[PDB]
Structure 1
Amino acid sequence: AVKKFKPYTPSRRFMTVADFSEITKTEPEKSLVKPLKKTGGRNNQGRITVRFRGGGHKRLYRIIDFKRWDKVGIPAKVAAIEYDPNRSARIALLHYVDGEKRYIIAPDGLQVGQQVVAGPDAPIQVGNALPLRFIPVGTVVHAVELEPKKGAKLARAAGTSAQIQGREGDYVILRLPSGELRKVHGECYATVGAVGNADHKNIVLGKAGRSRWLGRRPHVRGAAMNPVDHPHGGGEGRAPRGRPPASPWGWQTKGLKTRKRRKPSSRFIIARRKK
């Protein structure tokens, strides 16, 4: 449930904020944080390589457990659910009966106080992680590894999930958040349930200022530039595109497919995304 404001400024009229209701603890675990070194979109040569980035709020990185198969059989109690400035999902503090503490991304419906566990023998319940091959066909899942032991790569954003569609030998067939149909190795771990904070996508930033807080600097149109700068630059007065709509670097930007043709994963992708 996103929170609205009365129009007591021109911006509060449209601004909405997350309600932060699932959040039970407002300070991160000190042993699980490290500084997030801001880049401003610059690489190691000092060059901008992603435009319009920088100037957002300072953030600490929360170490997230994207393995789980790390501690098979060892149950953990869900100690808290917290805010993570570095991702859209919320995060859940686990207290393992081990005494070890780690974060996972909070699934939809996860309750503080509840217990979760990882392994081939884990119950099929929200927050538990199992290799894909032991998760029942049809169950929706998240934080999916792409290759065994390489860590969760798939369905991590707020509200997302993948669905197990079937099995074929060593592999299982997933419907990814994008609607892409794909084989993923059966030994890949996944966590049952969908990622929480599903209302994330209903947030209305409301004002330019809010984008700046997030480290997103103003984006300037190619049409607003000059020919030195951009294919769309120039023209007296306003100008239509006057050529196929292009990137600053000249490649076409309406439809031109860009995934590499002879890519080895093509053997594993059953059907390209929808919509």
Structure 2
Amino acid sequence: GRRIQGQRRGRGTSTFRAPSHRYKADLEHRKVEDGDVIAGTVVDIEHDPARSAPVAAVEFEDGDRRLILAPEGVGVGDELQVGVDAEIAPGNTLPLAEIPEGVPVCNVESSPGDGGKFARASGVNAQLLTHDRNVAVVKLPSGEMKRLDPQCRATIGVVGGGGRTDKPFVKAGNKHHKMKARGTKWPNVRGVAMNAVDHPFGGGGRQHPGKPKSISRNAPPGRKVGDIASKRTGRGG
């Protein structure tokens, strides 16, 4: 047959690419020689086309002007600080070690200095639970308990824009406009509505999948469709 849609994706053609050229900034923690002295002033609050969430423009003492992954509650004028000795208030960034356990955090680094990887979407947050001289245990929004180097920097507070998911799109048109701001092919045609040549679920006098939908982890691309390595399906039990 023909390569299935999931395979066209990888080639990275226009249709599957994100409108990068239309994006604003790659949100990452600033680099500080040391000392922490680094502080700056919120100059404005903008909309981030890549995350459908607000972002804060900040002017730093040493002249640097960069957009920042804004937590909820940051306003123009506020003074943010980044470093080991940063005060402990929302919007400030400092290593997990210097952060008091029990405090909600966002934009957490996977490894010290990577600029933040975890908890960055609308209204989410990580939860610093345990400290140590060797391991900082954080609970990520997925519920998992992650062990991190206490040297990993983070931002205090939860990400701005919480509750975005609460309102339904209501109409195809709204999805449309959102989708146009992401690296995604939309709308979605069901495999079972295709021809046998286009998808392992395609074909038939009526619409139904050919075999069972749970596919092995070892299935090859072109065949790995449906419920991938499902440990279970349905809702019962």
Secondary structure, aligned partner of 2:163: helix
Aligned residue identity for 2:136: V
Secondary structure, aligned partner of 2:147: strand
* 1:148 alignment counterpart: 112
User: For the structure 1 residues 103 and 171, does the alpha-carbon distance in structure 2 shift closer, same or farther, using more than 3 Å as the test?
Assistant: same
Aligned residue identity for 1:144: V
Deviation for aligned residue 1:56:
8.5
Q: How does 1:201-240 map to 2 (within 5 A)?
A: 201-213=165-177, 214-215=179-180, 216-239=185-208
Give the distance between the partners of 1:56 and 1:167, measured in 2 at CA: 38
* 1:254 alignment counterpart: 227
Give the distance between the partners of 1:81 and 1:42, measured in 2 at CA: 37
User: For the structure 1 residues 252 and 246, does the alpha-carbon distance in structure 2 shift closer, same or farther, using more than 3 Å as the test?
Assistant: farther
Count of residue pairs brought into register by the alignment: 214
* 2:95 alignment counterpart: 131
Deviation for aligned residue 1:52:
10
User: For the structure 1 residues 100 and 152, does the alpha-carbon distance in structure 2 shift closer, same or farther, using more than 3 Å as the test?
Assistant: same
Identity %: 36
* 2:22 alignment counterpart: 60
Aligned residue identity for 2:189: V
* CA-to-aligned-CA distance 1:121-160 (integer Å, 9 cap, x gap): 1111001000111101111101110001122111111111
**Alignment check: 8 A CA contact 1:144 1:152 kept:** yes
Give the distance between the partners of 1:100 and 1:236, measured in 2 at CA: 64
Give the distance between the partners of 1:67 and 1:58, measured in 2 at CA: 20
Across the aligned residues of Structure 1 and Structure 2, the Cα RMSD in angstroms comes to 3.0
Deviation for aligned residue 1:84:
1.2
Deviation for aligned residue 1:168:
3.9
Give the distance between the partners of 2:13 and 2:174, measured in 1 at CA: 18
User: For the structure 1 residues 108 and 179, does the alpha-carbon distance in structure 2 shift closer, same or farther, using more than 3 Å as the test?
Assistant: same
* 2:61 alignment counterpart: 97
**Alignment check: 8 A CA contact 2:40 2:60 kept:** yes
Q: Which runs of 5+ in 2 are unaligned?
A: 216-220, 232-237
Q: Which runs of 5+ in 1 are unaligned?
A: 1-40, 259-275
Aligned residue identity for 2:223: G
**Alignment check: 8 A CA contact 1:65 1:104 kept:** yes
Give the distance between the partners of 1:205 and 1:170, measured in 2 at CA: 45
Deviation for aligned residue 1:51:
9.6
* 2:234 alignment counterpart: none
Aligned residue identity for 2:207: R
1:85 to 2:53 alignment: no
User: For the structure 1 residues 249 and 55, does the alpha-carbon distance in structure 2 shift closer, same or farther, using more than 3 Å as the test?
Assistant: closer
Give the distance between the partners of 2:176 and 2:16, measured in 1 at CA: 8
**Alignment check: 8 A CA contact 2:214 2:230 kept:** no
Give the distance between the partners of 1:181 and 1:58, measured in 2 at CA: 32
What TM-score do you get using the length of structure 1 for normalisation? 0.69
Deviation for aligned residue 1:65:
4.4
Give the distance between the partners of 1:165 and 1:96, measured in 2 at CA: 31
**Alignment check: 8 A CA contact 2:106 2:120 kept:** yes
Deviation for aligned residue 1:85:
0.7
**Alignment check: 8 A CA contact 2:132 2:150 kept:** no
1:115 is aligned, of 65, 79, 85, to 79
User: For the structure 1 residues 97 and 184, does the alpha-carbon distance in structure 2 shift closer, same or farther, using more than 3 Å as the test?
Assistant: same
Give the distance between the partners of 1:217 and 1:51, measured in 2 at CA: 14
Give the distance between the partners of 1:65 and 1:58, measured in 2 at CA: 14
1:170 to 2:138 alignment: no
* CA-to-aligned-CA distance 1:205-229 (integer Å, 9 cap, x gap): 2322333332242211111012222
Aligned residue identity for 2:199: H
* 2:211 alignment counterpart: 243
